[PDB]
Amino acid sequence: MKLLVVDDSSTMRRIIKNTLSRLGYEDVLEAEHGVEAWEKLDANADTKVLITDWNMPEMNGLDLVKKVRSDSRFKEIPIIMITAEGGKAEVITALKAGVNNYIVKPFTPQVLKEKLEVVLGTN
Ligand SMILES: [Mg+2]
Ligand SMILES: [Mg+2]
């Protein structure tokens, strides 16, 4: 279960990576921006799950998701968006783009653990 976690917040990347570790998901690659994330996916198509935010310079998460879904290798990759964009217009936009599970920031570490366990369980 190779995961890629994309967020331009260093503290958020830490929280997510620690939470995944608590759930037994130890094989985690990070990215700060969409460009870097895409490069990593394109070069490591064995990646199993994409976790991404929305707002960030160097390609945002909506465009990253669109790009992922248009690639023949990633038609079925699970995509979790974790974002402060809590409005339903934005949720709808992201789901149309190919996001499968939407988690809205902010959260305590315990809440994130509960919400990720809902989608990924433990490993
Ligand atoms: Mg962001
Ligand atoms: Mg936050």
**Which DSSP string corresponds to 8-32?**
S-HHHHHHHHHHHHHTT---EEEES
Closest CA to 52 of 75, 29, 21: 29
| Interval between CA 35 and ligand 1 midpoint (Å) | 14
Task: Note the ligand closest to the C-alpha atom of 84.
Answer: 2
* 6 CA to centre of own chain: 6
Q: Which domains does the chain have, with CATH numbers?
A: 1-123 (3.40.50.2300)
Q: Which ligand is nearest to the CA of 16?
A: 2
State in Å: Cα 32 to ligand 1 middle.
9
Distance 36 CA to ligand 2 centre (A): 21
How far is Cα 4 from Cα 6, in angstroms, rounded to an integer?
A: 7
Q: Which amino acid belongs to residue 110?
A: Q
Ligand nearest to the CA of 81: 1
Contact 20, 116 (CB under 8 A): yes
Experimental technique used to determine this entry: X-ray
Write out the DSSP string of 56-107.
-SSS-HHHHHHHHHTSTT-TT--EEEEES--SHHHHHHHHHHT--EEEESP-
